[PDB]
Amino acid sequence: SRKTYTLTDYLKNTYRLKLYSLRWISDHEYLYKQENNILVFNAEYGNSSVFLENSTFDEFGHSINDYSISPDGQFILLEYNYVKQWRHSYTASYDIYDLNKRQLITEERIPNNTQWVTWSPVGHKLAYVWNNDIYVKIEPNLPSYRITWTGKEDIIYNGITDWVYEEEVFSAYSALWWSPNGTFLAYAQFNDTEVPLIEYSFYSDESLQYPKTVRVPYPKAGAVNPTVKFFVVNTDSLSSVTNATSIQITAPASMLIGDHYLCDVTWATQERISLQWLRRIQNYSVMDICDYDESSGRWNCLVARQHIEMSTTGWVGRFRPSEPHFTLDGNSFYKIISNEEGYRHICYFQIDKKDCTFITKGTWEVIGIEALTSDYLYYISNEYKGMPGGRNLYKIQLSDYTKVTCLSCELNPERCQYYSVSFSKEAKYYQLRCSGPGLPLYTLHSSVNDKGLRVLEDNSALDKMLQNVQMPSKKLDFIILNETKFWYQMILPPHFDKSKKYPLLLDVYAGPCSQKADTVFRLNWATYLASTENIIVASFDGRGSGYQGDKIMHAINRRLGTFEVEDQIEAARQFSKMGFVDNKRIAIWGWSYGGYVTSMVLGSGSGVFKCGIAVAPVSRWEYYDSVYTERYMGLPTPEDNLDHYRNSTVMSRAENFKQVEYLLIHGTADDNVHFQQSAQISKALVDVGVDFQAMWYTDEDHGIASSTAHQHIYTHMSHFIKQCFSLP
Amino acid sequence: SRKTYTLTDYLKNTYRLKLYSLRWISDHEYLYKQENNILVFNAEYGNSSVFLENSTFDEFGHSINDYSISPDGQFILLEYNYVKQWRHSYTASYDIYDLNKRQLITEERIPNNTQWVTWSPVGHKLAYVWNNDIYVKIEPNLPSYRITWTGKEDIIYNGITDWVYEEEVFSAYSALWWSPNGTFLAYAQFNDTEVPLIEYSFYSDESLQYPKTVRVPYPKAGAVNPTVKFFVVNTDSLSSVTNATSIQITAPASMLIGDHYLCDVTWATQERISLQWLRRIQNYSVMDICDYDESSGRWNCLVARQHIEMSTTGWVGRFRPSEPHFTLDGNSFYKIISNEEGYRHICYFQIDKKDCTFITKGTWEVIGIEALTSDYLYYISNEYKGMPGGRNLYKIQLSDYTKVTCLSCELNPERCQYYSVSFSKEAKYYQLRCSGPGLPLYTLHSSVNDKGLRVLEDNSALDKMLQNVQMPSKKLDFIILNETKFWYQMILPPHFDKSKKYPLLLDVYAGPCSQKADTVFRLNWATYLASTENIIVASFDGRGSGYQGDKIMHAINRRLGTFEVEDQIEAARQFSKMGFVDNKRIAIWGWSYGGYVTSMVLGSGSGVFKCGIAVAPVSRWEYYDSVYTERYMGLPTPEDNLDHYRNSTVMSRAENFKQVEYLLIHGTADDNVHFQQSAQISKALVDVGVDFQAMWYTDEDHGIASSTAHQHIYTHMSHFIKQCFSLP
Numbered sequence A, B: 001s002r003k004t005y006t007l008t009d010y011l012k013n014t015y016r017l018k019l020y021s022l023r024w025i026s027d028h029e030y031l032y033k034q035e036n037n038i039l040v041f042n043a044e045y046g047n048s049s050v051f052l053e054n055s056t057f058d059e060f061g062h063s064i065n066d067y068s069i070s071p072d073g074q075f076i077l078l079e080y081n082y083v084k085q086w087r088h089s090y091t092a093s094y095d096i097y098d099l100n101k102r103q104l105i106t107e108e109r110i111p112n113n114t115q116w117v118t119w120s121p122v123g124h125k126l127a128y129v130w131n132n133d134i135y136v137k138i139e140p141n142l143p144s145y146r147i148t149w150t151g152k153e154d155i156i157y158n159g160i161t162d163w164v165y166e167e168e169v170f171s172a173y174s175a176l177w178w179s180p181n182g183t184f185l186a187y188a189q190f191n192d193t194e195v196p197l198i199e200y201s202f203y204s205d206e207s208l209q210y211p212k213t214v215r216v217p218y219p220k221a222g223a224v225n226p227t228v229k230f231f232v233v234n235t236d237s238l239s240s241v242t243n244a245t246s247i248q249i250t251a252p253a254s255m256l257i258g259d260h261y262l263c264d265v266t267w268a269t270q271e272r273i274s275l276q277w278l279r280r281i282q283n284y285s286v287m288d289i290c291d292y293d294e295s296s297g298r299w300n301c302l303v304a305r306q307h308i309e310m311s312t313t314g315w316v317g318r319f320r321p322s323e324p325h326f327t328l329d330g331n332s333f334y335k336i337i338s339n340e341e342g343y344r345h346i347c348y349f350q351i352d353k354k355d356c357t358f359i360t361k362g363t364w365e366v367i368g369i370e371a372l373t374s375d376y377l378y379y380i381s382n383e384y385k386g387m388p389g390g391r392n393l394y395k396i397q398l399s400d401y402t403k404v405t406c407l408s409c410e411l412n413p414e415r416c417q418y419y420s421v422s423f424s425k426e427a428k429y430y431q432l433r434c435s436g437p438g439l440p441l442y443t444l445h446s447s448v449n450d451k452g453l454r455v456l457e458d459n460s461a462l463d464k465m466l467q468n469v470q471m472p473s474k475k476l477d478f479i480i481l482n483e484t485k486f487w488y489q490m491i492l493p494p495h496f497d498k499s500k501k502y503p504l505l506l507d508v509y510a511g512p513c514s515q516k517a518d519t520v521f522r523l524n525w526a527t528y529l530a531s532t533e534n535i536i537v538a539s540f541d542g543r544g545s546g547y548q549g550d551k552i553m554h555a556i557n558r559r560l561g562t563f564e565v566e567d568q569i570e571a572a573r574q575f576s577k578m579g580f581v582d583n584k585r586i587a588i589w590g591w592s593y594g595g596y597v598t599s600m601v602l603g604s605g606s607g608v609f610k611c612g613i614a615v616a617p618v619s620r621w622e623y624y625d626s627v628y629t630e631r632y633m634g635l636p637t638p639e640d641n642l643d644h645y646r647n648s649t650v651m652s653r654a655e656n657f658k659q660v661e662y663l664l665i666h667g668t669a670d671d672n673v674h675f676q677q678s679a680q681i682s683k684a685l686v687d688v689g690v691d692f693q694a695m696w697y698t699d700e701d702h703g704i705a706s707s708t709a710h711q712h713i714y715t716h717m718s719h720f721i722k723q724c725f726s727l728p
């Protein structure tokens, strides 16, 4: 094949993976943008036409970042002046374009710097947040109605999340929820008045004379958390004269006695809202069912339909309590619950009755419930061949739980072992999406008899280009430590020769419920390390890893920095035994939790690792955020888990770093894992006299993703790995 | 056999230089602390007594950091609880100890957190600043009188300087000047109300959950400067029931027209103060003579008495207008002024006259005026053997200027060529302190017939130890650039063989009026590099350097980062042409201003340097302080010197760094050359894809002086240089 997958190829995207992102707009049609045209496809027949021509806005003026078409296809939202904030948040400008008239709405426009915009599920109503306040427009061209007047920057958030709720709880900036009708608008309100601020310098452009201090309400472990409230407003009865009436739904009494979180909102019907609350000690959760009382106009949460979730061995759910999927009538629902043996399976709950009925069981887990029809429930699981790192679509016959059909397994067993799915409205069709081990495959199907309709993108263009390259192969297997199987993967150098000895690089994450050993196809830094530098890149899923039951996932409860660290070390020992690993050249690196684990490993004095790299690592759990840290570590108080908070830092292992070559990297504007974390690691090493290599990235955040920084850090790390392994 | 001067020897001060720090207390006795015993000596005869036994205070309760004994031996101040701030300022607690009796005053104590304390010149009056306000104690135990009420943190400073005055104007925290008598107490007041704040994070101990933000009033070049006022209070008429009355002395008309600084305060007599003022454009300065009017109880400055200093070529003075030395009756004075040829010499000024008369002349410069008597004026200059890097003590006959006799030139011509002096009150005696080229030698002398009285410290103990180690030699010579002599020095390896070829490390500073080629003895990092790693460390003083005349010092005017940069490169070219240097291994490094020059040189594309280190470098003049930066660069405006501010940044030279190996180092708590400077450098390098090495030092300031930090950075730079020179 002559050539290899080079560093430049990775940094420059020489070999591009193609995708097929569609947007379902009904039971049978989806939108797709080919070039800069928006085409509408008919799923059954496959015909399409151009919905919006790439030239419709050539004279718009600004560069359009994104668009959003109303549910009734009458109007389209135009998103420009995009300015990113955190992982999900950002601000932008919006213009609405009438599809029937083919003209831009110019009256009662949406304000610049809008924080969030969303159409109603039906019709064409809009709800947006500006200045931390919620506004509503019944019609695109009509004046908006103000819903809240309490908005205040960095203090009161109406309709949007504060920093911690965005990152750790809702995984979104949005905090608004239209009802199926488009009648009610539910929204949460966060108050960060007593939440401490994390401050750090932002240097900006060279022209700025004085560095700017960024301040963000951020609750570190054990600090004051933000408080939350929930409201519901009737959108049909809005008046231009009187102020909107927001009905508040209060949290259960079992929640009010202390700090808690609103962790899930789900409309069950036009008049029933489901709410899940979580105590600050995340081992107790409550699901509330609230019904609208047409006569009084209020919402009542009967303590009859209250469903409780507790956990003795750990925390609730994988990262948070699971989402409930209601059947049409709203009287019952399904949700993933850890079963009697610690394995997560689908549960059937009937509103006003006790317990639930498990409809799936076994030594494997359900990853997620994807669709729910009158006859079947569709879900993704890692059941096939007992490979926790594989994923397939299955459907259960609701009138007979024993009848489970696998919908993806046999489609192409050698190329596709990791699917994800996207169903149309009412699930009449579904786009299957395979991520590996072979090249990504996108296909369309009809639900009726699960007939494959057509291929959407098979990545033939990439396949041909790679045939020209000496690509590395992937090995997915397991080792038995005690009586348990622990999975691992190895990116192996082309023309792999087990008689030879290769240097090994342990690529680490290892956080709670993580999975680094899977069947996914990836073109990344490790591909370059194996293809051009002949390095073996390995990952190992030890205790604490997810999707293999609680026995494995909860072994790390209240003890972060122990078993996951010991297991990475034991894995490298194991790999050494295999005659194809030069034990004098074993490195290790990781980003974020992987950075923390990597440092913890390097500082263990195990003698197994020559060098390692840690990027933006956590160094002391009291520095990281409350929702994430408290979930696994409890509170940093004497009565609780303060001792392990104190015995699990990277700083106390400083002396042992004199036995390795360490490279510590971190962005100065990191709002997630504060530069402080590395500032303290470096200081501990200086005080003990250990030499080490460092690199800061000015104004880069946790991702260090800007194109220049991205290219730079990977070039820097590559040089570091080559010199350590003596690879000119 | 003999060992080499190792890195560890440097880091651990294995070979300590001995000192002899005395404090003249009268015309014939001086205090000297030996083994924590404070002793009094008689200069003429050498006999001594024990003034304070190291045993006293053995039970004080706090570790005494320092002490200060009243002018008339009646009381002694105990400084404890010392906490450092900037270069000169600090905060400490104080206790007074009554010598006559044997007790500490237990009441009316100096408050904790005092910012400054000072005995009057005679007797035992005290003036101290607390919470930015001035206080006065007539008697150590009597209650203190408050002199000001306008003190406010970071805004109004009475009695103490603000950040930029401490650093760039007075080289002290104190802004208090007692009268020779002890009658008046003059003081300056600073208002920093509109001065912008520089902000940076202080991580502190590992136990601080949230990083602290440090905020300091710091005027960057062109920003708003603090304003200043001058006051004089009669300390002999303080009332317990009446707020003291401060008479203000207004600055000259020519200063009030715009921004200006108070740069010098000097009492001439019991009733005559001398104040020097300087315009923000440091091209013009005014000296005011203010006489007290006992009949009006007010101070007046006759305009006709003002003395003006203008500079056409550069700025006024070396760093600031020179200090005036008043004759006893206060009607005349001497001061160093740049002469018509460009060389600084002594000028005699009679107060109700206009110009002045030069007392010395020649192609050399007077460094400082040390003592003045009715018959003689003693000064330090670099005239001996025409070596700008030498310093000797001379005395001129006031009744005949042609009779100038050198007082140190021949004491030990082989060992001592760099002297500094310290005269007793009335110049009866003087201690000579030689700094090199041989080991430091401390001698005492009598002024009468300039007779050497006795050796005080000759460092014989240190001489013994060095006999057992291969010490490097130092060469101080010169080269010829365009018809001019420019001095340089080389720290040559032991057993230097001019036939072999050694790698050379250029040690640069090169700031305006700097001098790196001198005759002083030093045991530093360079001693280790030449002795152990056999590397020649060279230093070169080019255009812009001092003590050689204005034609050389002012060449750099309004053009920093131009000629001084070019000349470091040219010095290397020439050195590279000496048969004893390997032109493949030429490195360069510098701290602070030397960091800026090192970066500008490494980015010039000269191809002369293989690598370089820049510690806490400035990278853009608009980022440093106003007083210092505007002194050489003018203001950063379109009408002035904006273009060259923009044309002299390290950032604009990024691309060229791909030709060399760069190591950028900076402390995060640097309040002098902000981390920002170095942060903008790295961002530029990344933005253009250049690889380099970096290292930040948590909570270290400009000196990166903490024991551990100091050891770590020199260890880190030694590895970097050895690897670059292919040294084992």
Ligand SMILES: COCCN1Cc2nc(C)c(CN)c(-c3ccc(Cl)cc3Cl)c2C1=O
Residues within 6 Å of the ligand: A167, A168, A509, A511, A591, A592, A593, A618, A624, A628, A672, A673, A702
């Ligand atoms: C495959 O590797 C995972 C990469 N990601 C994605 C992600 N998402 C979230 C919301 C979190 C929670 N802060 C983490 C996260 C988990 C732990 C720490 Cl200390 C820091 C972070 Cl940012 C990670 C993370 O790393």
Ligand SMILES: COCCN1Cc2nc(C)c(CN)c(-c3ccc(Cl)cc3Cl)c2C1=O
Residues within 6 Å of the ligand: B167, B168, B509, B511, B591, B592, B593, B618, B624, B628, B672, B673, B702
């Ligand atoms: C042998 O080397 C000299 C070391 N020193 C001593 C010193 N003192 C002062 C008052 C200044 C002016 N801030 C500088 C100074 C001069 C220029 C810059 Cl950019 C920064 C500084 Cl702090 C230096 C300096 O470096």
